[PDB]
Subunit: 222 residues, 4 copies
Amino acid sequence: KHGLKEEMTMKYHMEGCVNGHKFVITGEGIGYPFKGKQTINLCVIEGGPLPFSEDILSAGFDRIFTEYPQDIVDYFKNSCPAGYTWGRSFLFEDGAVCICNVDITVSVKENCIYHKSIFNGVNFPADGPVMKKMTTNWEASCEKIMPVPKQGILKGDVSMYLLLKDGGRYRCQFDTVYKAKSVPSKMPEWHFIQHKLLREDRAKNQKWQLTEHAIAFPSALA
Amino acid sequence: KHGLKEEMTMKYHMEGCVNGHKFVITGEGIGYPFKGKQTINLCVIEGGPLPFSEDILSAGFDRIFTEYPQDIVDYFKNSCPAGYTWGRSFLFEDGAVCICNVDITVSVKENCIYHKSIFNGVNFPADGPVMKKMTTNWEASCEKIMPVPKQGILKGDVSMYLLLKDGGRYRCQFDTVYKAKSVPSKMPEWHFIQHKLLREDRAKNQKWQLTEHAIAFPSALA
Amino acid sequence: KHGLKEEMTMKYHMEGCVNGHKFVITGEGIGYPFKGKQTINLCVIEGGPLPFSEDILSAGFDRIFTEYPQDIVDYFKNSCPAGYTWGRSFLFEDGAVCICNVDITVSVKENCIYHKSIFNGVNFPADGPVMKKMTTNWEASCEKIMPVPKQGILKGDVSMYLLLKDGGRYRCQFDTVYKAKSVPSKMPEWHFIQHKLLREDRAKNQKWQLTEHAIAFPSALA
Amino acid sequence: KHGLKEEMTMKYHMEGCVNGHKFVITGEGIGYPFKGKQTINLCVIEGGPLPFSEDILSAGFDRIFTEYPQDIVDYFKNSCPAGYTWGRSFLFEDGAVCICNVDITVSVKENCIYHKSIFNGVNFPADGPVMKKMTTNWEASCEKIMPVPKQGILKGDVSMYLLLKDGGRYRCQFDTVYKAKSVPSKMPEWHFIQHKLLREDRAKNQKWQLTEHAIAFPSALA
């Protein structure tokens, strides 16, 4: 109906720079828009091996892949097949900061979703979990999604924790704007989305895999 | 079992200072620990009429009043009847900041819960929603609750929105530590709590009423 | 002329609560308004010994004691003898937060300046420099002072570093509003003030001493 | 001695993306390393006309151009002719965020300094001063420069104000790391630098000019 089928494929290109190191990452994978699941495999083709933990890039590679109850308006699916863009800031508690822009576009012909990313960051401390690769996975999280009705865009807000090998928690504040590639017809009331995101790594060429399950749920409290 | 019954009464004393103005507020109300509901009525007995919106004080007056599924450890109820203390910072987006400390203690004899608060704030702009009283209610929110196992305490984190009469959203970041008044035996895995909080105001003496429904829910994603 | 003489005496009362611990501190000392120097001695009379480093309270006990070139309007001296109030937030990098309100009033009769403070804080980590007393002194700093002409008040902004015994730096963001106790006649262009602040401690009763030198200087760059 | 002469020329290339709009800017100008002055002219060659105020990019195009008293170690000049890189985050008070990386390299042959920049940003509000071009100039500022001795790098910290056409002030927090392109021999004690930065705009092709005067000064307070 909007270009999507219960099972689809995805391609991801990310160009970036962290702490002055450039890199390019390319990724393919499988996803289930209505189940709210993606699984994707990534490969560094430039700048490898990354001197910073791969975890920082994970949310840098798609809300189309969210399970939405039919009662709530799905802005992301509604934007398809042309798709949507978004931008996000990442504010880490040790002062590091990153920013990401992503253009997402559905190719109905090939039943494939494309993701081009620019990812940039700075001020990760040399002696901190990211440049020393002491991060494990991101905790599950619950995101708030708020309409900016006058603008036709959405804002997301979620405070995120990265778990440390050595026990602890490393915080990162995510602030996101989501913009349909053309004017939507309806606009959701605000709502939550719950997320789970896991990484499993893979010595010739740096590679790894990510999985995400996400589910939307109304403001309403029983 | 821990001093609590399905229906209870509450008393609230808050002493504070906002933008240099002091005040004292006293409150009584009714609550349902296991349903996760309180309703409470408040009266200014000093410093009235408040020159700042009453909304800022709302979370300043109890997690005992949260509905907890039996599967997740309820730290707050477990701390009763002696109870617990907590402290919270409030970081508003226009630069204003507030802090609150609260001592909570259950009187099993009288089936009553006492709440003593100190509330302080500064740097609310004269020409902003709080000092001009243009705030409506707080949006529903979803709080994260994280164990600090080594310390026996909990940390809460939730980014909060106050709605404006004139449409918009005014943000406030809440960071909280919760400390049982003596050493707990078990410690919850981390979890979410969903909140709803509403104000209805009441010309002799400044008074108003607050209602809260809150429900805990596990990290797990179906 | 405004109640002040090249040498004066000061009295300081601070009531506070940090991390749930209350206390009262009383202080006397000597100061030189036009040289921009104070030296003051402090004594805990309640809640002693403090479980948190004394450094956090240092800026919590007077801009009257700033050296001002005659070319720039001195708002603080101009507010005397009635004096002025102020409020400040303190945002530490580990998430702790404090707030202070202070009423300052000159007693020309006795050539004495009074300082009443309320100081409150929360969320200092148990295992961090403040609750473990691993702080040394605050680095020198340069504060920005900005007029809010329409309101007749001033805003101060300075990012502050506390030095750690074990080498490092612990950051704290200070945001301040300064309010004359009645309407001033002129209002400064904005400007810098440079600060130096040092602590030397003193087993019967917890006591210590603070010294401050501060000098104002115009926006202008040679 | 380190490749520099009292008068030099500069070339600037910046590639960027703000709020999803890409662009390329190219710039030439004249500078006086030891007087701490640059003046530079800029031209958009891609993406013009910018939909966001030009002010945001101003600090995005060199500390070599700082007047340093001989008593304080000049890390930047010392890094020449090979030069140095740096990265900076920009945290605006309305939630927008930007990041910049810059590689600076001196061509002694041609008495020219090259500046390649990547500049990225997001979450500038549509209805805010930057996307509506209501900004004037940046106020003068005083930056703190702190050595990270173990790493051989420097950290800068300065809270910045952009002035608004319609009167007001728009805040931006700058955090910077400066990294010599090879290991320096000495390391400065920390210090201040005072900055002044002004823009004058110029209908065929979007162009404009920037000027900067900057002067370093020791921690010491007379």
